[PDB]
Design a protein around this ligand. Structure first.
Ligand SMILES: Nc1ncnc2c1ncn2[C@@H]1O[C@H](CO)[C@H]2OP(=O)(O)O[C@H]21
Ligand SMILES: Nc1ncnc2c1ncn2[C@@H]1O[C@H](CO)[C@H]2OP(=O)(O)O[C@H]21
Lengths: 277, 284
């Protein structure tokens, strides 16, 4: 079937990394499809010495859909190069478990980074910078006709110099398992995913950023969200949030996808906020 | 919201989290005046986590929709649901010893151990009880799809209860369940035609049952030990199967191998598996 074909293709030069040059280290955690460990890679992509990397691999009780997701992440990330998308360095397909080798983000997920922060100390300026960097990577992805589908603060990584890196491409599709609370209303009711449903998820992410890692729709069971959204309910303006920022969020959550901003409009708005402040 | 099943939310009290399964979290609970039974009754409750996806909601509903229709001494009992004024909750029979995998693994450290005292006779009994439940489920035109020692529970009296119906599917129309998309059952318990061809039948449940048999005789051992799941595509197609474990008779191993025949029609059906296990029991 489709997976057995992808597996066999994968196991049969630009991306293949010698397994002997990879030294696995500390476990960082478990993602959408497997487990992530810190590692050092000797002579990665013509670089001197050891480069610190993150390595993705499957758990032993992996399902076909988890393996499909790993190979999907590899196949998407090969096509991508942007400062605010996590970089793929390669894969080990010839020696034991399949491994993907990716750029290491030393601060971990944006969500943890924020939850450990107070308003390190972060200013609204920082937060808008973070949002803009993500919106740039998203513009780039949308231009390439890739729909991410799983945009969330848990899926953005914070690299050296607090640079945002869009991560976790297991669910992305070259134009469901996405948590209900980050999904666009048409994705919930019609199962459609487009750049405009990525814009919806981006609005939930903005809300996460502004609340420094809050949990969306708190006290609302995801099973009860479908009906609340269809009748027009949205999250209220959070505590330390401007009218303009909240206007931006709300527009991401317009019922009609055509009435949502595009990522260029989202980037424009944050560039304007930055300079005017 | 079915009147034969809906239970007053105020009569249910949730306790500690027992773990997370295929679609959600399971919590120990107590229910007051449950199905005419006086006082409180200890139960297990299935619910969604806060970051639940549509597939996990759909799996919870699938478990409900299956358990509504089945009743067997070796299938976990559904007692009710709360589906109004809050999170959706399934209320099910509590199994005091937890999963079979856990119970067997504890038997390696907790005396009297494998000779809480377990013989091969007890293991055969456990496998037989599960085979009886599966024979009935197969009669009901259901495929479980996720048969594994982690999805069998051990209730009072060490009685086996087939559990975790989130991935179970109806085959009443065509005697097979087929999905275009990729499955969510761990690769190592999947039949070869489920893995390559996406086909699930009672005979792919038989294959999984054979993996469960191997788990049982190894006292909760890990299938295809040391083998990365992606290697199973090649490994199975080229005819390799797990080796006879140390604790296993020739007869018991022949049954496992019959469960893993490449041709599904060459595998035993659950009625015949139950018979093989009965024969083993009686001859000591
Ligand atoms: N490229 C990466 N660099 C550093 N950490 C990562 C990377 N990709 C994922 N992680 C971490 O793995 C976990 C599951 O996704 C999650 O927990 P974390 O440490 O907050 O950052 C993530
Ligand atoms: N009906 C039940 N009674 C008792 N424990 C249960 C029940 N259903 C599931 N579990 C337990 O929930 C956990 C995640 O699946 C897992 O850990 P365990 O205690 O080994 O048994 C399972």
């Amino acid at each position: 079937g489709p997976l057995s074909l992808s597996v066999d293709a994968f196991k049969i030069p630009k991306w293949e990394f010698p397994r002997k040059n990879l030294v696995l280290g500390k476990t960082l955690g478990e993602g959408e499809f497997g487990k992530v460990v810190k590692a050092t890679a000797f002579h990665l992509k013509g670089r001197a010495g050891y480069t610190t990397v993150a390595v993705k691999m499957l758990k032993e009780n992996a399902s076909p859909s988890e393996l499909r997701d790993l190979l999907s992440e590899f196949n998407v990330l090969k096509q991508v190069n942007h400062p605010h998308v996590i970089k793929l360095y390669g894969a080990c397909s010839q020696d034991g478990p399949l491994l993907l080798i990716v750029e290491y983000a030393k601060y971990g997920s944006l969500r943890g980074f924020l939850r450990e922060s107070r308003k390190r100390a972060l200013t609204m300026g920082d937060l808008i910078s973070f949002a803009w960097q993500i919106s740039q990577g998203m513009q780039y992805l949308a231009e390439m006709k890739l729909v991410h589908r799983d945009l969330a603060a848990r899926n953005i990584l914070v690299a050296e110099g607090r640079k945002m890196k869009i991560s976790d491409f297991g669910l992305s599709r070259d134009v469901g398992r996405i948590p209900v609370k980050w999904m666009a209303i048409e994705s919930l009711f019609d199962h459609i995913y487009t750049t405009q449903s990525d814009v919806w998820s981006f609005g939930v992410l903005l809300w996460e950023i502004v609340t420094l890692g809050g949990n969306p729709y708190p006290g609302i069971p995801p099973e009860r969200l479908f009906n609340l959204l269809k009748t027009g309910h949205r999250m209220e303006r959070p505590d330390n949030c401007s009218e303009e920022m909240y206007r931006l969020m709300l527009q991401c959550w317009k019922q009609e996808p055509d009435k949502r901003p595009v990522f260029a409009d989202i980037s424009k708005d944050l560039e304007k906020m930055m300079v005017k402040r």
